[PDB]
Amino acid sequence: AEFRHD
Amino acid sequence: QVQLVESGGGVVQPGRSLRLSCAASGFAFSSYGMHWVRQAPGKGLEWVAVIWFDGTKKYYTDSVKGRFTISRDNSKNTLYLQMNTLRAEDTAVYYCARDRGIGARRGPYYMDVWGKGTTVTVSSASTKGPSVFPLAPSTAALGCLVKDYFPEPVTVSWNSGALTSGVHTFPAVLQSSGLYSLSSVVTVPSSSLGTQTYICNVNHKPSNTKVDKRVEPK
Amino acid sequence: DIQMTQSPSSLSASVGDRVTITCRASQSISSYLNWYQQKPGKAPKLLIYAASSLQSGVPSRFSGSGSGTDFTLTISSLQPEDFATYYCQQSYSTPLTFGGGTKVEIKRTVAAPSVFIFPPSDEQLKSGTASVVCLLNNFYPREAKVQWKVDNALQSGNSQESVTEQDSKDSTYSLSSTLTLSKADYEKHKVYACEVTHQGLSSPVTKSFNR
């Protein structure tokens, strides 16, 4: 689970 | 005076471990996210890992998942990187960098402050001083071949520092044996060879080796 | 994972010129794009964040534009200190990725390399190994090709090369190419040649020797 903006 | 100072780097064998530290000063450490960025010798920048300001979220580049662990002790103003199961391709200069964040969740935005870096060399080679060989001449050119040493670095001057102009000491290359090699060449007018003597001064601190080699036309 | 493609990988320029570099993203990163400057042996330095915002303290000549997938870094009028390598980095989603880097070097007129070749020393020969060095000296531009032949047998893979940076005075490059052979393999042949092609050279120069 990667982090993504918005 | 905002500062980030990395330490912990050194020579390590493959499959072994290393803990990098990064001491922060001059700002509110526990309010910033921190990153570890690395640069293999002669290559570009590669992101490694980020940890949130509150230490609650961590992300890693794929090649280090399950091997590297990023941590922080906000009390000590210290960032840490635990590097397990090291491989040759982990050889790099490692930088810590602070990221202020953006958005509601304070995810990464930009890296405005960096440390100077710490050098990690992953090799199963053991400390070994160089063998210095002449590059004999015949504008003329001569030089020294500094072959088969470990680890970096080695320094080369000519005539005990007297001779400087016309000298090119090349960046070292890593051979398939895992030892390093470099050449230092100097260019001088043809007339000089008959009388002038040319010495290259090789110093390899890690193995405590100093060598003076005279380069002569054969 | 988002790929950052930087172009060109290298470029030449002179003081006062206007330079532009491009980072292209494999998918939209909105405007989470950053630009960094790095000089040899030094840590990166942030120039621009959020595609167009300029980091506090950075000269006004630096500017950036772009959104989505295409981005530009602009130096208005170049300066002597600006000759360095520039990386872009997307900050939209993990894993965070940098571009390959764009080296900005000093432009100068074409210069040809002075080629020398060095047989292995007998001192080295006793040990059981033989290194043949070929020295390309003070040429321009950086691009060059070096070709090793041993009795016309083309050598591929058993050589390495390293280059200096541009010189403090004349902005030139120098290149060493080292061919590595066994002692026995060295004894078994007579002609060792270094063939060099370069823009400043009208025809491929060949420097050779015999055992």
The top-level CATH class assigned to C1-107 is mainly beta
The Cα B96–Cα B113 span in angstroms is 9
Indicate the DSSP class of residue C84.
S
Burial B3-41 (b: 16+ CB within 10 A, else e): ebebebbebbeeeeebebbbbbeeeebeebbbbbbbbee
Per CB-CB distance under 8 Å, the chain A contacts of C30 are 5-6
In 3-state terms, what secondary structure has residue C176?
strand
CA atoms within 13 A on the CB side of B71: 11
Contacts of B152 (CB under 8 A, 6+ apart): B121, B172, B180
Structure determined via: X-ray
Q: Please indicate if any CB of chain B lies within 8 Å of the CB of C128.
A: no
Distances (CA, A) of B131 to B146, B149, B180, B202, C124: 6, 8, 11, 9, 9
CA atoms within 13 A on the CB side of B152: 18
> Which domains, ranges and CATH numbers included, belong to chain B?
1-124 (no CATH), 125-218 (2.60.40.10)
Per CB-CB distance under 8 Å, the chain B contacts of C101 are 44-45
The Cα B52–Cα B101 span in angstroms is 9
Indicate the DSSP class of residue C140.
B
Distances (CA, A) of C126 to B96, C62, C121, C129, C131: 47, 57, 9, 8, 12
* Cβ pair C92:A2 closer than 8 A: no
Residue B215, beta-bridge partner list: B198
* Cβ pair B183:C36 closer than 8 A: no
* Cβ pair C32:A5 closer than 8 A: yes
Give me C102's structure tokens.
């764009």
Residue B21 · residue B115 · CB < 8 Å: no
Q: What is the CA radius of gyration of chain B?
A: 22
* Cβ pair B107:A5 closer than 8 A: yes
Q: Which fold has domain C108-211?
A: Immunoglobulin-like (2.60.40)
Q: Which of 1-6 (A) contact B at CB < 8 A?
A: 2-3, 5-6
The Cα C89–Cα C29 span in angstroms is 10
Closest to C47 measured CA to CA, from C28, C70, C74? C74
* Cβ pair B103:A2 closer than 8 A: no
The Cα B131–Cα B133 span in angstroms is 7
Q: How many angstroms separate the CA of residue C85 from the nearest CA in chain A?
A: 28
Count the helix, strand and coil residues of chain C and give each as a percent rounded to the nearest 5.
5, 50, 40
In 3-state terms, what secondary structure has residue B159?
helix
CATH code 2.60.40.10 region(s) in chain C? 1-107, 108-211
